[PDB]
Design an enzyme around this catalytic site. Structure first.
Site, PDB file in Angstrom:
ATOM      1  N   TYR A  88      -1.150 -10.680   2.735  1.00  0.00           N
ATOM      2  CA  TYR A  88      -1.297  -9.273   3.097  1.00  0.00           C
ATOM      3  C   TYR A  88      -2.794  -9.038   3.303  1.00  0.00           C
ATOM      4  O   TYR A  88      -3.530  -8.821   2.343  1.00  0.00           O
ATOM      5  CB  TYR A  88      -0.693  -8.381   2.013  1.00  0.00           C
ATOM      6  CG  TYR A  88      -0.721  -6.886   2.281  1.00  0.00           C
ATOM      7  CD1 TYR A  88      -1.109  -6.368   3.507  1.00  0.00           C
ATOM      8  CD2 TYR A  88      -0.364  -5.990   1.285  1.00  0.00           C
ATOM      9  CE1 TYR A  88      -1.145  -4.991   3.725  1.00  0.00           C
ATOM     10  CE2 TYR A  88      -0.400  -4.632   1.490  1.00  0.00           C
ATOM     11  CZ  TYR A  88      -0.788  -4.130   2.709  1.00  0.00           C
ATOM     12  OH  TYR A  88      -0.793  -2.756   2.900  1.00  0.00           O
ATOM     13  N   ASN A  89      -3.229  -9.123   4.559  1.00  0.00           N
ATOM     14  CA  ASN A  89      -4.602  -8.877   4.971  1.00  0.00           C
ATOM     15  C   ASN A  89      -4.790  -7.413   5.333  1.00  0.00           C
ATOM     16  O   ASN A  89      -4.210  -6.944   6.316  1.00  0.00           O
ATOM     17  CB  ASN A  89      -4.961  -9.736   6.179  1.00  0.00           C
ATOM     18  CG  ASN A  89      -6.461  -9.826   6.389  1.00  0.00           C
ATOM     19  OD1 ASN A  89      -7.173 -10.304   5.523  1.00  0.00           O
ATOM     20  ND2 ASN A  89      -6.937  -9.392   7.548  1.00  0.00           N
TER      21      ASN A  89
ATOM     22  N   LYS B 181       0.947 -10.307   7.011  1.00  0.00           N
ATOM     23  CA  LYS B 181       0.882  -8.928   7.482  1.00  0.00           C
ATOM     24  C   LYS B 181      -0.589  -8.573   7.678  1.00  0.00           C
ATOM     25  O   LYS B 181      -1.355  -8.574   6.713  1.00  0.00           O
ATOM     26  CB  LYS B 181       1.534  -7.971   6.478  1.00  0.00           C
ATOM     27  CG  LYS B 181       1.266  -6.483   6.782  1.00  0.00           C
ATOM     28  CD  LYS B 181       1.732  -5.552   5.658  1.00  0.00           C
ATOM     29  CE  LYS B 181       1.369  -4.076   5.942  1.00  0.00           C
ATOM     30  NZ  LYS B 181       1.605  -3.143   4.778  1.00  0.00           N
ATOM     31  N   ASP B 182      -0.975  -8.275   8.921  1.00  0.00           N
ATOM     32  CA  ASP B 182      -2.358  -8.040   9.306  1.00  0.00           C
ATOM     33  C   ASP B 182      -2.503  -6.560   9.635  1.00  0.00           C
ATOM     34  O   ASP B 182      -2.182  -6.132  10.747  1.00  0.00           O
ATOM     35  CB  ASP B 182      -2.777  -8.895  10.499  1.00  0.00           C
ATOM     36  CG  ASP B 182      -4.331  -8.976  10.657  1.00  0.00           C
ATOM     37  OD1 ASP B 182      -5.057  -8.599   9.715  1.00  0.00           O
ATOM     38  OD2 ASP B 182      -4.830  -9.426  11.714  1.00  0.00           O
ATOM     39  N   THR B 183      -3.001  -5.784   8.670  1.00  0.00           N
ATOM     40  CA  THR B 183      -3.270  -4.359   8.868  1.00  0.00           C
ATOM     41  C   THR B 183      -4.706  -4.176   9.344  1.00  0.00           C
ATOM     42  O   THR B 183      -5.656  -4.212   8.554  1.00  0.00           O
ATOM     43  CB  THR B 183      -3.030  -3.585   7.589  1.00  0.00           C
ATOM     44  OG1 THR B 183      -1.650  -3.684   7.268  1.00  0.00           O
ATOM     45  CG2 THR B 183      -3.426  -2.108   7.766  1.00  0.00           C
TER      46      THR B 183
ATOM     47  N   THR C  74       0.826  -1.200   0.000  1.00  0.00           N
ATOM     48  CA  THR C  74       0.000   0.000   0.000  1.00  0.00           C
ATOM     49  C   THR C  74       0.863   1.253   0.000  1.00  0.00           C
ATOM     50  O   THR C  74       0.610   2.194  -0.763  1.00  0.00           O
ATOM     51  CB  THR C  74      -0.930  -0.020   1.212  1.00  0.00           C
ATOM     52  OG1 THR C  74      -1.798  -1.152   1.105  1.00  0.00           O
ATOM     53  CG2 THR C  74      -1.771   1.257   1.292  1.00  0.00           C
ATOM     54  N   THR C  75       1.902   1.280   0.849  1.00  0.00           N
ATOM     55  CA  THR C  75       2.703   2.495   0.975  1.00  0.00           C
ATOM     56  C   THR C  75       3.508   2.765  -0.291  1.00  0.00           C
ATOM     57  O   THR C  75       3.795   3.928  -0.605  1.00  0.00           O
ATOM     58  CB  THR C  75       3.631   2.399   2.188  1.00  0.00           C
ATOM     59  OG1 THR C  75       2.861   2.168   3.376  1.00  0.00           O
ATOM     60  CG2 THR C  75       4.406   3.686   2.358  1.00  0.00           C
TER      61      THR C  75
END
Ligand SMILES: O=C(O)C(=O)C[C@H](O)[C@H](O)COP(=O)(O)O
Ligand SMILES: O=C(O)C(=O)C[C@H](O)[C@H](O)COP(=O)(O)O
Ligand SMILES: O=C(O)C(=O)C[C@H](O)[C@H](O)COP(=O)(O)O
Ligand SMILES: O=C(O)C(=O)C[C@H](O)[C@H](O)COP(=O)(O)O
Lengths: 293, 293, 293, 293
Positions: free
Chosen positions: A129-130, A154-156, A42-43
């Site tokens: 990538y959640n 990776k749990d955002t 995302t970044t």
């Protein structure tokens, strides 16, 4: 536990990836203690990048390090498959994919098949990538278990219960959080680290928070966590993704060019207001010997 | 009030656009009374398509009809601009864009600038595509006013107060609802029509719901509206976007090829069960004399 | 279709039901065309009333009319059962209950048993009061069908699809909407009316909107609907439930006393600001001969 | 860091409070190491109780212990005031209130005034009970500061960032999490403990999770924490609030009578299946030597 930077993609004034500024950025982040680099997240505006631009990003960063997680997801599976297989010629940690975004009302069955298909062709380990807010759906601990092929996640998400559950149901999975605001809490509760966009521009802060908490100096970890929290908040005022550029320049000297519109650059006046809201913090971070200046 | 079809994008087995099946499909839709064709919307897998594919779609449907609204938005603004400008050589109703999807924490200032930028370059009237659940953000009637350049709006949201508010605050704006289930209600309440995914496979029904309600046969309209609702429910069991392909083949008798993975084609058993869920309703429609055996 | 007023409970300065102001209010509302009175609803602060105070409210309003729906719900079932059975000595339209509020994670099974139990003991027909925002759960068309004993439903929810579905699955059910903003749309689409808190203070407006729409003068219904919408909005500025008191006094002459804290009365300064935001409207409503003044 | 039990309210067959079973229960909880008793919370069906019943509960538990937090809020403010003032003759830790539940569209100005009013009359320290999902509103750390009189906070929300923010903005405030699943994390991250419904039936486990984590045995703490999570999941199948009664009888061996309808007691078959879901975990706990056969 580790700190992983979802690294910014820097763009020219005419909307191409600026590979050289991207190498500088990457070079510095490793120098400052960052364990791994998560490319096309995302970044880094991965959804805004073509398959070819996603490979460009990989190649540039690979000119600096192997410590790469290569995000290949998108709404064209043939293209993702292609990138997964191209990555065999790279000695990297793994590949990753957010869930297919935008379309609501997708069956669990279709979401599983999306991931199991990437697993079947990947030459590296596969990281989930959640990010439910961004993608509209949630590959929770149970669905990740059903898919049964992830090396890490990776749990955002703000709910740390959700994140812990991956470890509870998948004890061998590396479990990372996407929050910059939970670096301290993650280190201290037995999870494997953070993918922290804020480490793009204050890698010193993120590494130190992890160490203080690894060292059980919780009151001290929290104190620094809270300063970084105020920095995250400030970057959200004008749009975190655009602000990530201004804040790297300010805190780390070098300039990353521009984002890709509709991720619009801040204007000179916004740049100035954003600085003003963090220069007090920077002072206290140099006063605390975390920053060189 | 108008019925507008967000037209399905047929793909070939090797994941290319089947322009010939698309022409056949658009021909039939116009022959059956569809007012206009919305091209590269959700139902046509707009976000899955590249700029060059969104253009291929315009050209294919423009060899059949010029009652096109041309959806052109995305996460690379320079490509939306390029597609906007290209449409000058086409005699079409307008262009449209959803809000930038995926990225949360986008500023109103930036969303506005994106839509204003497409108005500044557009050679045709500009329509707003509001789909908050799919894109993560809500361009409500206040923001559409502040933007100020929208000829119409498609409001896909399960809240007709929100839709009505566009007419109240923008009295000269064409206001359309994205719901198949609100055709009778929209016609009857003074709004300008529906962009109805279901009219891909049952345009006779959608066209006739609107007709009855405007003849003030509110009761027959609901009667027919409720049968249509059951077909929409059917289609959602396995995922509307994929089930739409099956339902066209069944009701209209031509095959639209394949969706684009991660939108996965129903397998033969899903195809079987879906038909079983609607065949009773198809019968009823032949009895009411809305369809031909 | 009908207009039903969820009638305000007026309180003294020392926090008792002011039965005489409540009779005045009720007397006037019937005079002005209101079909039915819904007693102990949200607008009457039913959750803040003891079982005994809920019967007080019934008795007072019964000194004026039989056209009563008597809301008896709460978090003590024995008390609800008691009120349901006490209502046998009243020749009224029915009784009603919102779903049990506050506690999240209640099984459908328990929610059904709550209602089926009230049905088993009710001496009148039973009306469902669905308000998911207020109660935390949703007794949708299918669950209402499973419960299988409702004569009508008040559906307070912006999604008119949700509301229509009750009629689609329960064709004999009286289906009302809880929105003041959908009076016009409801009349025109084939539903049975509105339970409209705004009819407390502008019953003239609500009745007229219904009639204009019943008369197929949709453009005219909408125009008035939109003025009433601005009045609803204004009352939300300071808290709709407190403002409902000030607006009745202003628009209808008589004073209803006070709400029950934590529903705090507006202060004199808020009263003044709220007036200022509607006096322009009142003018246009007298200029339109809907109001006497 | 403390473990605080929101204590269950046992009711008799005829829907009265069984004070004797409540004393037995509170005795055992203190004997097993529970720091404090939270009385009339969600788990004790606070909102289902009348002022007079909330007081009966204080008196029963005060004949056993004085480590009480006395929850006193509701929709009649004069009754919360009355209960606040009455507690002056009791040597207790403090009083608490959730935000006014049910009514949406309440102003911040009014929520603040409600909590300030309870501080102005309280003869003991005042604790904030934040449960946004249950009450419809969020008294976050900014609002708790603006209120300014809270000694502590219980934050039932699935977002520990939100909970951390209380400590950051109110450094002297006791900050507790409402989650059973976050005991290890809270202890380990520097927060002040958990108000854990599950410690009604497994106080040995909750007390021991906290102990291990503070002995820095982060690994055993999670191991034990994850088994506790499975018991919480079990309890939610049929509804936590009702299943809590069954689980106490099973694990602690005394019977807590009946919940209060609409909170319905599990029937014998639900009771059977629930036990089957946990008996494996009870075994494991006897082996780890946390429970006695
Ligand atoms: O950039 C990535 O790929 C990763 C990290 C997070 O996904 C983003 O930084 C957004 O996370 P929040 O806005 O903090 O909720
Ligand atoms: O398709 C379009 O472009 C338009 C109409 C609505 O957006 C769809 O009817 C919603 O499609 P779903 O996401 O399957 O619910
Ligand atoms: O008062 C009653 O009993 C009834 C009518 C509605 O429940 C309320 O007026 C709240 O509805 P909204 O705030 O418009 O969403
Ligand atoms: O009970 C209290 O007073 C406190 C702790 C939490 O609020 C509950 O653990 C939540 O209870 P549930 O609504 O069943 O999830």
């Amino acid at each position: 536990p580790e700190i992983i930077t979802p690294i910014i993609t820097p763009f020219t004034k005419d909307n191409r990836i600026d590979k050289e500024k991207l190498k500088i950025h990457a070079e510095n982040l490793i120098r400052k203690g960052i364990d791994k680099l998560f490319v096309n997240g995302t970044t880094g505006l991965g959804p805004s990048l073509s398959p070819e631009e996603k490979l460009e990003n990989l190649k540039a960063v690979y000119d600096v390090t192997n410590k790469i997680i290569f995000q290949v997801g998108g709404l064209n599976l043939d293209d993702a498959i292609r990138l997964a297989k191209l990555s065999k010629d790279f000695d990297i940690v793994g590949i990753a994919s957010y869930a297919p975004y935008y379309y609501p009302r997708m069956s669990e069955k279709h979401l599983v098949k999306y991931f199991k298909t990437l697993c079947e062709v990947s030459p590296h380990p596969v990281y989930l990538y959640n990010y439910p807010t961004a993608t509209g759906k949630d590959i929770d601990a149970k669905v990740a278990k059903e898919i049964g092929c992830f090396t890490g996640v990776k749990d955002t998400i703000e709910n740390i219960i959700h994140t812990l559950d991956y470890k509870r149901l998948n004890p061998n999975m590396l479990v990372y959080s996407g929050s910059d605001m939970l670096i301290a809490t993650v280190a201290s509760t037995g999870l494997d680290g953070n993918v922290a966009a804020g480490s793009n521009y204050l890698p010193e802060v993120t590494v130190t928070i992890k160490k203080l908490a690894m060292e059980r100096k919780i009151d001290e970890a929290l104190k620094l966590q809270f300063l970084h929290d105020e920095v995250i908040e400030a970057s959200r005022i004008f749009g975190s993704l655009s602000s990530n550029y201004v804040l790297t320049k300010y805190f780390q000297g070098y300039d990353l060019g521009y984002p890709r519109p509709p991720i619009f650059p801040l204007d000179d006046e916004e740049e100035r207001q954003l600085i003003k809201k963090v220069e007090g913090i920077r002072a206290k971070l140099v006063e605390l010997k975390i920053l060189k200046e």
